[model samples]
Target: NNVNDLIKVTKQTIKVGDGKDNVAAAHDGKDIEYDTEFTIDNKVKKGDTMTINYDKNVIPSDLTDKNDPIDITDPSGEVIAKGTFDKATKQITYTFTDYVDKYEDIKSRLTLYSYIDKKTVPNETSLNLTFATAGKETSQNVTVDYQDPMVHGDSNIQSIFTKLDEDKQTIEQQIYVNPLKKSATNTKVDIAGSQVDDYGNIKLGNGSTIIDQNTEIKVYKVNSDQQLPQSNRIYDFSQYEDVTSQFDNKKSFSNNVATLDFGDINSAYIIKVVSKYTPTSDGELDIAQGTSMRTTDKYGYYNYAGYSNFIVTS
Candidate 1:
């Protein structure tokens, strides 16, 4: 084979310093400024190809050993990426194409079965490595190391209620939420969707669905395509700071008698349809949280095509 068409591996030495992240060591590379002799087409180039070999004359020397799995660690101590090697390159370039980059800069020690048409020596030699001084890319560790965590505590109060803010405009309120602590309590209420909408004006099947506000529950969407809107859906209650805070504040109440009073209602809401809890306390909820909001209505966002179990063979 033509030498030019072959691999041109330059002996490299790298010194890893205490870079950011988990890279907390340093290395020193030697020039090894010696002439290598290479033979091509029967003509030899001095100072190019030398018989590299195992210093101890090991019978077998390659990445085949399970203990020699490729180790990949990044500059940051936060991650240790997994990697593998294909032996096919052993008979060809004797080079590792996939593991081109594993560290901020790498200087791996590889002892190979180096040989020639008529020569043999030590079985160990350094392939000697070097990596391009890649540009420093911005990075972050997603680990959450909470400091001074809040201690857990609990308290419950019975029979508590608050009057609705009469001055508040109807457009200011949304679906009411509250923890059920008191049963069959008299609470002036009309649980009805906007008669204006051709949809959402659902008819309750039984008395279960016609309860006055004293409960916090989600309105699940249930139509095709628009059924479960993604997290980004405009109708997403989270979009309104009031809506989010309302739910959060209510849930934080823990266990206690509570009343949720949404003064009034207006177009500020689109009754994310719901089944009238007409059957009363008689329903089983699934992980989707008994609401499509947690389902197809999950966060709507862009996503690239995905493929797993990646590999290439030649």
Candidate 2:
């Protein structure tokens, strides 16, 4: 039989760790390892060569530093061939020097250490490899699982508002805290924009118009499913903490501009603020227009979320 029919590639696989038998979840800009095995039915000539082509997404771990050579080893851990990677072609060609001189029915494996390029890799993709020996060619594919890294920003918080009364004079503001479930500190909500005066009271129109006594605040635990309470439905009363007393005693109010602080937050919460808004003869109330929320991580990285303005018809 010819060399093409005698030699056969038995198995090949790719994973995230070195010597790992199964593929594990991979993250952005992390290392990957590839393995391939072959069986030689007959003796391979000294000058015979086997080449492997890797997908463009898999970059050698040492491609940027020093391009080390990949070694092909026998079952007994003896080096049989040396593979030199070609960066431009994304291929590795191994030449069997004299290791095959006295061997027959040989089994060998090649392990490649590399990494997946985040810019070109998808959430779920495959690592492809093509092998060519003598006049025969074969290909293999292995699934590569990917997970997205958590990011911090405006999207981490959700700010929404709904009219509490038919007259539109009363507004219900809901600020969803730590929607991303990221740990944070100095978490607080600022009402009517950052209109805090030197005395820390919110200034609106000609004078302070927020009904401070009638303003009610509550903090409710969000369900494990992470669903926000609907505006039309009543909040789930099973798990809630009334922080109105703390709001009143902690200097959380400055006129209509109330800055409710929640301190450190590690869980999802809904801050419900229902306040009676009395506009001074108003065609439009700018105070009901800008509600904002802010939070900072332990490292002081700040994030912000803003709510849209409300329209009042007198």
Candidate 3:
């Protein structure tokens, strides 16, 4: 019997930051964490081992002191297996225990904390990972780009509208706060000593309807160097907190404006809004707009940023 015949590798993904928060760009000479996931079929008996090897450039130092480097969880969010990292070999090994006997399949994920070497900067480089068992082995690679250190300033917001359905009847808009590392200040206080919050307001153009219930807000801790995806599809949001309830006017789209209250700009955030789109005629539709506001000074004034874009409907 061969390990390849007994086990099946289902999925593999590598993201720039750790499991929680992710950035659009990475800086050199800084510590970055990678969140990788692998889904495997459970066929082998207990005591069988799975080993993963990473590129040397990916992990420069030992992670022995960092707790919870790897975890295997099922669909129900139960931890099935845990793995350890070897500094010298730059590998992680997982030994299945009696936990496998309870389930037919297992999903596992690993997070590696590493420093971005100066040598790997100013351009793109490939980071590789290899998974091996008794008689089976597979390798996966992801390309990452590195840049010089970022000069942090006041955080900014950006928004984009993308078609969600084939008929162009539904549109999805994503609002990103501090997607670019232009700002280091995540939160600010007003003159009265009350904490100043961030706000995202969206106004869909004519013939568009905003859906209140389907809107969602998520926040993540910006951990390390990482790049955002080229497409609008967001893959990894693990360890993120859903802060939809914290918004004051989250329920209704009063006056055609969907208001989102981001209590603190302490971290990075993504606000997803789904709306109904109905174009009157063909050609380009009116531009949809979104505005973000945050306290910039102690005088109770606000710093504002506007994002506007249009989508063509046939």
Candidate 4:
């Protein structure tokens, strides 16, 4: 914590009570006796991560007028009841409805979730302030499958903490594991322009286009015929570690991709690939051999060539 160090307070919505018009509430920062409490501290500041797991209050079901016209059979029950007491038996059967929806199950279809968005801001020390809730406003109903009041098919996430947004709003965003995604795509150019040393092999060999400085490769077996200098050749464009990259070199790699979802939100076909390293004691330096090999990442779309240009020679 430096002189410019500041604390940011984030407010998450904790919805309580079960009704068609359920209320979105904040942590009271005090212990409660009436119902379950979510508050933790009194002083508000910046950079504070306030999270609230939704409160699922099951709507108590009340039987509608249990008293029904019980047929009083003196001799025989009336086939057509002329008296109110001669009516048929009216049994009360209750139908079950959803109470909690798994965030995973409906994350693709629903926008009710919570997550964190951190940014080291300018000055932190003198930024003590309160994030007042603008109160809850009902979002316009979005029809899904021709059903009105887009019902969250039984959700466990009753309330969520949205990343505090501008214009006095806490816009809801999808929640998932972090570091987002790490991806690298390969693009190799075959059929070189005469200048390429094909060695008469004539497969789409590796082109000499540097994808990025952080490119890596592996040598499975050495082709003694190729020689030591040609050991590390361009396999794909840029090779990253395995799924887990959190190790000696970079020991903080896990699931590289994350799934994003929002309630009645837009379409998302996002594919994330995190980079991790495979354990290799001493890897040979990848050389530029064969034809020209390249890897390209246009935004995040990855296109890998079927054949890579390089051979591992021990």
TM-score of each: 0.15, 0.40, 0.38, 0.12
lDDT of 4 by residue, 185-264 (tens): 33222221111231223332221222221322211222223221111112222232232222124212112211112112
Greater lDDT among 3 and 4 belongs to 3
Give residue 218's lDDT in candidate 3 (0 to 100).
39
Best by TM-score: 2
| Candidate with the larger TM-score of 1 and 3 | 3
- Writing each residue's lDDT as its tens digit, candidate 3 over 1-314 gives 12334544444444445311323211112345544465556676666667655555555332113333445555576766567778777666666666777767565555554543323332456666443432344455655543221112353655544334535445555555555644333242111001112233343332244434443333344433654442322445564556655554533344545455544554555666656544455443322334353535344455554443333332
Q: lDDT value for candidate 2?
A: 0.54
Which model is ahead, 1 or 4, in terms of TM-score?
1
RMSD to truth, every model: 26.2, 21.7, 15.7, 28.7
Q: Which of candidates 2 and 4 reaches a greater lDDT?
A: 2
Q: 1 or 2: which has the higher lDDT? A: 2
Cα lDDT tens digits for candidate 2, 1-314: 13444557787765566312213211112355666777865567776776666657766642132444557777676878777778887777777767788787688877666655444553366666543443344555766553221234522444444334536456665666565666667767665532333222343442222635456666666555654442212335455544445555543555455666767766766666676655545444433434455667456677666543333222
Model 4 off-target regions past 4 Å?
Answer: 1-160, 166-170, 177-314
Which of the numbered candidates is closest to the native, going by highest lDDT? 2
